[PDB]
């Protein structure tokens, strides 16, 4: 039995066992649409045509937010399919293939954003990948075509492989580069004049690690807590998974707030226009 067969089964398994919870998650998903469609559109409008700068971070955030937009749009697509086209399980592949842009291709995008920050702040590379948007496009296409190599796997007609390769490994390299930036931005000898943006950078970099340890950890923890430790009932297996998909999709609403909206350099464009 394929994994996405089980996903489509679990989508309507709580319908009937916990129907009020199912409508509560209906409302939560609708609110996530409401708060993540206009926000992502405004971020794209202020970040594509309102900015005349071409550096890796801007283009990285542009592609991060377009996958955010696509996963946001595919969020009330599984529900529309499951409410209007009941049945159609292998028929409705994009409703599960919205996992291509969440727990996939949106973890590596944050990862490469963090390594870009490490390469641009302390610069332990020399050439910094020779800068230029060309290497940014190369890395973006790399991750776009590497998320396919792991989304095609795992759910083939393997569960612990996705957690160990796509969650533990990007988190390890994110937490080891954020920790390096904290040491570099707190070296003794720096001027006591810029310690208001050098401490907001510390706060704005530890925040995005906490969001990673809240949005994406409960789904991947459960997905290894079912195969390895099967002593848990289907009632708890079903309510935990269905509540740790909105937390995983809560990153969609919390992505341009931390990466696009608190940036005071580009925040004045929205507030000035």
């Amino acid at each position: 039995v394929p994994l996405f067969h089980l996903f489509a089964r679990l989508d309507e398994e709580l319908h009937g066992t916990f129907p009020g919870l199912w409508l509560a998650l209906m409302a939560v998903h609708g609110a996530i649409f409401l708060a993540g469609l206009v926000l992502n559109g405004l971020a794209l409008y202020v970040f594509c045509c309102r900015t005349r700068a071409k550096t890796p971070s801007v283009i990285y955030t542009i592609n991060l937010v377009v996958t955010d937009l696509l996963v946001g749009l595919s969020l009330p697509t599984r529900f529309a399919v499951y409410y209007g086209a009941r049945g159609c399980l292998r028929c409705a592949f994009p409703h599960v293939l919205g996992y291509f842009l969440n727990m996939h291709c949106s973890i590596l995008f944050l990862t490469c954003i963090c390594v870009d920050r490490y390469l641009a702040i302390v610069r332990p590379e020399g050439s910094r990948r020779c800068r230029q948007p060309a290497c940014a496009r190369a890395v973006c296409a790399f991750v776009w075509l590497a998320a396919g190599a792991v989304t095609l796997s795992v759910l083939g007609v393997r569960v612990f492989a996705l957690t160990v390769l796509e969650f533990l490994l990007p988190l390890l390299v994110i937490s080891v580069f954020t920790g390096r930036i904290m040491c570099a931005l707190s070296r003794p000898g720096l001027l006591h004049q810029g310690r208001q943006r050098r401490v907001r950078a510390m706060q704005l970099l530890l925040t995005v690690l906490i969001i990673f340890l809240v949005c994406f950890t409960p789904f991947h923890a459960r997905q290894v807590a079912v195969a390895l430790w099967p002593d848990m009932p289907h009632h708890t297996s079903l309510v935990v998974y269905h509540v740790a998909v909105t937390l995983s999709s809560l990153n969609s609403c919390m992505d341009p707030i931390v990466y696009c909206f608190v940036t005071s350099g580009f925040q004045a464009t929205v507030r000035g226009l």
Partner: antibody, heavy 122, light 105 residues
């Protein structure tokens, strides 16, 4: 053709055996309606056995009958197969299968048409 | 599990309105079906969602009530109306049928 749910004929049963019950649906798209099974006994009323989606394959059982009955669906001929193991003398009853429509505020709303009933005596 | 209790067999006369109540263990709002079962025949559908009729059935029988305790009224009785009437709870996934009522002259 109008919607119908044809059932297998009457079958004889013995203790410590197994039985199969087959339902075939016509007149509508099978994968767009759930197929449910109910048990009807002479002494008491009726007890709902379970249901299953023909297309998704999501099977749900009653807690009393969980594990006792096994549900399968073959979509080539639109057949729902209900398998009973370790037949008991008190399991002598009439098994019905019903078409269910997927609603909005609940998973299922209408059990509109049933079958003619499959009588099993142990 | 919501155990459903039903009214017992009630004697009726020809050309007289009758009403039979079915009770529930927990609140169901408006989520109970009403069925009739003829003598030795397949049980057929009468009322869905306790307030609506389907497939052009006659309007002489109708359900009523909200919340926990429900009723159905049939006016008047018919020669083919002598049947066992049943209530399905639906709000909770394990569905339960009623005890049953019989109509006699």
């Amino acid at each position: 053709s109008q919607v119908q749910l044809q059932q297998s004929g009457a079958e004889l049963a013995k203790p410590g055996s197994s039985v199969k019950i087959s339902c075939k649906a016509s007149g509508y798209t099978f994968t767009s309606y759930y197929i449910s099974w109910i048990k009807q006994t002479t002494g008491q009323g009726l007890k709902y056995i379970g249901f299953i989606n023909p297309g998704s394959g999501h099977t749900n059982y009653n807690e009393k009958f969980k594990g006792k009955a096994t549900l399968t669906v073959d979509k080539s001929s639109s057949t729902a197969f209900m398998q009973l193991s370790s037949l008991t003398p008190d399991d002598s009853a009439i098994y019905y299968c019903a078409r269910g429509a997927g609603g909005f505020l609940r998973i299922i709303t209408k059990f509109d048409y049933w079958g003619q009933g499959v009588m099993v005596t142990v | 599990d919501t155990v459903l209790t039903q009214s017992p067999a009630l004697a009726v006369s020809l050309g007289q309105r009758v009403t039979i109540s079915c009770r529930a263990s927990k609140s169901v709002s408006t989520y109970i079906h009403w069925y009739q079962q003829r003598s030795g025949q397949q049980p057929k559908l009468l009322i869905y969602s306790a307030s609506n009729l389907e497939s052009g059935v006659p309007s002489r029988f109708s359900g009523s009530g909200s919340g926990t305790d429900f009723t159905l009224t049939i006016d008047p009785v018919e020669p083919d109306d002598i049947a066992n009437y049943y209530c399905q709870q639906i709000n909770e996934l394990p569905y339960t049928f009623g005890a049953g009522t019989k109509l006699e002259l």
